[PDB]
Design an enzyme around this catalytic site. Sequence first.
Site, mmCIF file in Angstrom:
data_model
loop_
_atom_site.group_PDB
_atom_site.id
_atom_site.type_symbol
_atom_site.label_atom_id
_atom_site.label_comp_id
_atom_site.label_asym_id
_atom_site.label_seq_id
_atom_site.Cartn_x
_atom_site.Cartn_y
_atom_site.Cartn_z
ATOM 1 C CE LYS A 1 5.107 23.398 71.587
ATOM 2 N NZ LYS A 1 6.202 22.478 72.068
ATOM 3 C CG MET B 1 5.131 26.764 74.542
ATOM 4 S SD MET B 1 6.111 26.817 72.864
ATOM 5 C CE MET B 1 7.363 27.848 73.341
ATOM 6 C CB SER C 1 4.491 22.418 75.455
ATOM 7 O OG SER C 1 5.643 22.393 74.577
ATOM 8 C CB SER C 2 3.665 19.571 70.330
ATOM 9 O OG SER C 2 5.124 19.890 70.530
ATOM 10 C CB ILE D 1 13.357 22.119 75.768
ATOM 11 C CG1 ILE D 1 14.525 22.684 75.792
ATOM 12 C CG2 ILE D 1 12.555 22.303 77.200
ATOM 13 C CD1 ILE D 1 14.587 24.402 76.312
ATOM 14 N N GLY D 2 12.071 19.044 76.835
ATOM 15 C CA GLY D 2 12.382 18.044 77.896
ATOM 16 C C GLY D 2 11.092 16.791 77.520
ATOM 17 N N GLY D 3 10.897 16.947 76.394
ATOM 18 C CA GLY D 3 9.884 15.746 76.040
ATOM 19 C C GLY D 3 8.655 16.321 75.092
ATOM 20 C CB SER D 4 7.426 19.595 74.113
ATOM 21 O OG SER D 4 7.115 20.006 75.600
HETATM 22 C C1 LIG Z 1 8.623 20.645 76.095
HETATM 23 O O1 LIG Z 1 9.602 19.685 75.778
HETATM 24 C C2 LIG Z 1 8.347 20.662 77.464
HETATM 25 C C3 LIG Z 1 8.255 19.318 78.274
HETATM 26 C C4 LIG Z 1 8.906 19.381 79.701
HETATM 27 C C5 LIG Z 1 8.128 19.886 80.832
HETATM 28 C C6 LIG Z 1 9.000 20.116 82.060
HETATM 29 C C7 LIG Z 1 7.988 20.426 83.214
HETATM 30 C C8 LIG Z 1 8.637 20.268 84.440
HETATM 31 C C9 LIG Z 1 9.466 21.242 84.723
HETATM 32 C C10 LIG Z 1 10.981 21.063 84.688
HETATM 33 C C11 LIG Z 1 11.588 20.011 84.839
HETATM 34 C C12 LIG Z 1 13.174 20.104 85.022
HETATM 35 C C13 LIG Z 1 13.867 18.623 85.016
HETATM 36 C C14 LIG Z 1 13.443 17.882 85.890
HETATM 37 C C15 LIG Z 1 14.175 16.695 86.212
HETATM 38 C C16 LIG Z 1 13.763 15.414 86.923
HETATM 39 C C17 LIG Z 1 13.540 16.074 88.294
HETATM 40 C C18 LIG Z 1 14.752 16.378 89.056
HETATM 41 C C19 LIG Z 1 8.631 22.042 75.505
HETATM 42 N N1 LIG Z 1 8.583 22.508 74.249
HETATM 43 N N2 LIG Z 1 8.975 23.457 74.091
HETATM 44 C C20 LIG Z 1 9.671 24.050 75.305
HETATM 45 C C21 LIG Z 1 9.990 25.308 75.432
HETATM 46 C C22 LIG Z 1 10.059 25.593 76.824
HETATM 47 C C23 LIG Z 1 10.621 27.125 77.124
HETATM 48 C C24 LIG Z 1 10.957 27.809 76.075
HETATM 49 C C25 LIG Z 1 10.794 27.349 74.710
HETATM 50 N N3 LIG Z 1 10.380 26.175 74.398
HETATM 51 O O2 LIG Z 1 9.271 23.096 76.297
#
Ligand SMILES: *[C@](=O)([C][C][C][C][C][C][C]/[C]=[C]\[C][C][C][C][C][C][C][C])C1=NN=C(C2=[C][C]=[C][C]=N2)O1
Lengths: 543, 546
Positions: free
Chosen positions: A111, A160, A186-187, A207-210
């Site tokens: 990545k 990302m 994001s990967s 950080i949220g599923g990436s």
């Molecule tokens: C991935 O894990 C990112 C995947 C998650 C994408 C989230 C997009 C939606 C925005 C916010 C969600 C907040 C919570 C919602 C809860 C339900 C609704 C209330 C990833 N990979 N790398 C990174 C990253 C991001 C920032 C800095 C470094 N790395 O994210």
Amino acid sequence: TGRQKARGAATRARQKQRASLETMDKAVQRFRLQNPDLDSEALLTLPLLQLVQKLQSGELSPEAVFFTYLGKAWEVNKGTNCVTSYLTDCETQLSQAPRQGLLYGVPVSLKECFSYKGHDSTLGLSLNEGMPSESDCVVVQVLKLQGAVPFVHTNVPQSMFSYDCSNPLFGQTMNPWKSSKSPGGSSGGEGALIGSGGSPLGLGTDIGGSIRFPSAFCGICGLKPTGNRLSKSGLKGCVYGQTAVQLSLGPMARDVESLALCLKALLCEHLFTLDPTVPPLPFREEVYRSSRPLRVGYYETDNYTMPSPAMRRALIETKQRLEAAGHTLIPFLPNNIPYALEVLSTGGLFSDGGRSFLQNFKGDFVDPCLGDLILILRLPSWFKRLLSLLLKPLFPRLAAFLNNMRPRSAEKLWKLQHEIEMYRQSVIAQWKAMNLDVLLTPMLGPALDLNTPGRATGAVSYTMLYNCLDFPAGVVPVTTVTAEDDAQMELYKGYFGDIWDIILKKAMKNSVGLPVAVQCVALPWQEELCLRFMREVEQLMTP
Amino acid sequence: GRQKARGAATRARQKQRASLETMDKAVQRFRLQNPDLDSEALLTLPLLQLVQKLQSGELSPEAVFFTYLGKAWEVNKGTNCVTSYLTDCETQLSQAPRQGLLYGVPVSLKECFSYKGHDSTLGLSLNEGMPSESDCVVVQVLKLQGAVPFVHTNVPQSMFSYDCSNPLFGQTMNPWKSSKSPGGSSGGEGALIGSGGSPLGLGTDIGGSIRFPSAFCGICGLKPTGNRLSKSGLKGCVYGQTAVQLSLGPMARDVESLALCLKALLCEHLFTLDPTVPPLPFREEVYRSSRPLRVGYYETDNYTMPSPAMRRALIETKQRLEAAGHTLIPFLPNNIPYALEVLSTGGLFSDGGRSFLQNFKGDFVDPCLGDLILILRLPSWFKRLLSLLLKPLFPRLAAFLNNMRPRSAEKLWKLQHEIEMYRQSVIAQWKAMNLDVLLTPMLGPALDLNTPGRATGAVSYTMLYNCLDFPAGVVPVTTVTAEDDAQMELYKGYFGDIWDIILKKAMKNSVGLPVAVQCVALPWQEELCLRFMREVEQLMTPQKQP
Ligand SMILES: *[C@](=O)([C][C][C][C][C][C][C]/[C]=[C]\[C][C][C][C][C][C][C][C])C1=NN=C(C2=[C][C]=[C][C]=N2)O1
Ligand SMILES: *[C@](=O)([C][C][C][C][C][C][C]/[C]=[C]\[C][C][C][C][C][C][C][C])C1=NN=C(C2=[C][C]=[C][C]=N2)O1
Ligand SMILES: [Cl-]
């Protein structure tokens, strides 16, 4: 206007990409000319563990494996646009790879945020262009010390912070199964490259599923460990010092055993001495290799994101086959998921109202794949509040999102941080009360249309929970969407009927043949047991 | 308006009074049944040997328990270190798992370790009459290893202090000299263990609170990396502050006791009871290593001028390590003033002290806290004004006032990232010199009662390693001589501000008092840190071990 710098960065970036790919092509054509009798189909279809064995025995040369994979990478990029940069260093590294290394001769994809000496980690952002990394990050250093050959940087969505995969510099990455579909993110570059056979092993972040989204969407395996299991030293990020919800890095690959090998190779003295802040927990092989019956917690829905028909069938069919194999399947849903998502996760990630994050976008284009996130984060705190109160009676999920992405004091951040801590212990207590070994959940899928993940934010519920909780979570492909699954999606409503539910239905249309996963979870630091469970699922669902 | 605070004090004292009487009755009963027991012999056995005789059956758990209980009661008379007798421990003594690694060992507990049925007041009226409903995780593990937790020991009000008085149970005194502080915040442990009343205890540490009382009372203590042990069930007064992490760890008469305690705690019981703690087993071979060491050292941090005794302690230890074949390398972590004034102060008071200060609503403020409460209450704008006025003459005081102001989550993220970068910078410094461990001065000797709260700058030696979150322990290596003490008349401090002036006076009249050094290793290297502590102990006090 205000985009001259941004346009210049995109122009120079596209030219670097074009020149990288040309350099790859010439290297490949040169190798093939010298090795016309090499069976590249044989080599490419070898499972990683077999490839590793033949590299270690000398039956395949590192050059044969490298250039064969490089050619395949270049080829699959044509339909997917997953590669941003060729890590040119890697032909000299190829011939210097430590010979007893556990990943000796293995080409690995990275990545783009994994810093690599002499290369940008743009993250699709204009401000990070022409800022080449002064050194390899720690995990890249350890990969190299284990004999691996990092060969490409792969695409990410701008910043990302998205589970799609487009930025204004390198553009849009496409799912290799269907070009109108997102590879996840994001990967996303990793998912698309590994998923089309262009790389046997890669690293992503989550950080949220990436790690899990692109794995699920592209039909491959992925593991997000506990956040501080692997070293994040030298990783390029865009928000610094947010520790409520920690980032995690982990492997992506075609099978579970590749994930275990990659984890085993990374969890060595090299890593532990290069980054003393990571606890020196070796890979417990005996736990990974164990074959005891498991108490498996499971749910078919989180009551937040209605599963697609394909998702629910995949979950149910896995549950059933686990039970047939001697495991005890126990209904279990972590308590207070709306709280964990709307208050803890949203508030942890955006405690400052989105300000730090938004610094990244100043003077930049906003990729369409990010939806209205940037527009929404930019709203004044008072307007987020007003709008939240107005929406609450009709669309409480939307209202709660808006209310919890507002700025706050350090005092309120401490309070939130303690609540995250207490919530982690609450779910651990619940898990212990049922005496679970592991937990089986649905995973988002099948793949959504390009440019819709940014408009279906609620759908991160299945993944984001385990970032909030900081449990190891991985995904395994178990099935593909049938005609019946796809027809049943026509009747999908969702639990809320707000814009996020409405979009998901349309975004998953026309999905027959696409891979669908399940998610496997264990307690903090139990990566080996989580992988042991993922292995069981893989044996039962793809025998 | 103190009717509530007075009532809490009245009730707390009756409970302490009743606990001590229950101990006395229990001790007298046992003694009448065991007139021939050689209690002196038993009380002076090193913990390792005590443990062996318990495991073999040569000593009964009851003999060890009631003999230490007698001693604890006796030594409390002059120290006021015990707040509560953990009454169910006699049924625990009879149910102690027989192969437990601490089978039969009485363990003293800092009052903040939740124990079922008992308050964790922290010296605060608001926590009085609010008994814990379960043992904290480390208390459960100690009991699963056959140990007998037996008393809660005193802490300064709120625990945010390196003295040891509160309005509820009063003031704990140093067993070596009653005009001196035992240190703190784990001062009751320091006083109890340092006078022979407990073979082992647990304390906590966010700015030195294991290490101050260990040094002042002349015992050994370890503050591990923050998340090596479970903090589940620990009573605190501020929650969610993660920039400067809290840590928990053993205090005892020798380094080997600290190692045994860690080995017993780092077991499956702990790792299953708190999955959030990385399941890192105690590495015996690392602790037992006899290989030469590369030892970084400094004789001063250039922030707190060491006492003549601290400085002799460090230099003598350094020279014996050199004579034992170790390589002593000068080393000073970069930017100490910034680490203390910006990162540590800003990290502990990111919210301007508001969360902390809620605890004192309606309460007396113990004199041992000095003016901290008064200062934290000052309006952010006044802290800023006073900071700007003091800066030319008293830059340390000005920096303190400036960095204890409230801030946004955005600014807390910035500070947290700066903490992270700083930790990696000292790590890079350490690796560039290929250090194994680091030897530093430790604050000593014991300050007079009620002066630690007025000498905040002196936390510099210990607080640095909370900021960095490195394992750090202390070992007694010498005692203050008349020569050392007379030399305090020439002590000026580096700054000449109130902190320097209070410290000079406070460290005087200390002849015969114990002085320690500090031993530091990288994060997660508790075993190597203990290996090094073991080496210091053997070279400087060879009779504490065989
Ligand atoms: C991935 O894990 C990112 C995947 C998650 C994408 C989230 C997009 C939606 C925005 C916010 C969600 C907040 C919570 C919602 C809860 C339900 C609704 C209330 C990833 N990979 N790398 C990174 C990253 C991001 C920032 C800095 C470094 N790395 O994210
Ligand atoms: C002990 O570690 C507390 C000992 C430290 C006492 C500090 C008193 C001075 C106040 C602030 C210092 C800030 C930094 C000064 C830098 C130099 C000057 C610029 C301890 N034990 N337990 C706890 C504790 C505290 C709060 C919650 C939980 N535990 O602290
Ligand atoms: Cl950790």
